[PDB]
Amino acid sequence: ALVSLSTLRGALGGGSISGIIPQEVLFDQWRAGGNWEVSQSTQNRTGFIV
Amino acid sequence: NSHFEGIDNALQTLQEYSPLGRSVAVDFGFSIIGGWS
Q: Where in the cell is it found (chain B) (predicted)?
């Protein structure tokens, strides 16, 4: 027998508290002058904390 | 990633206060004991 997704994305699975967890310091410095830029590669990564 | 200079220059200006054409404070002191006349 068939079955529809039946809100399996939002209802049947309910919800859960989620977040990010620090694991490494990619960049850490200080500067007195113009604005800041930092270009960070997205390769094999999911999220960052700034 | 070329056009590094657009941000390499930014890295350079940071340390652009090397001790040239600049001044620092110099302190002169005194000491007196038991009053004066």
A: Virion
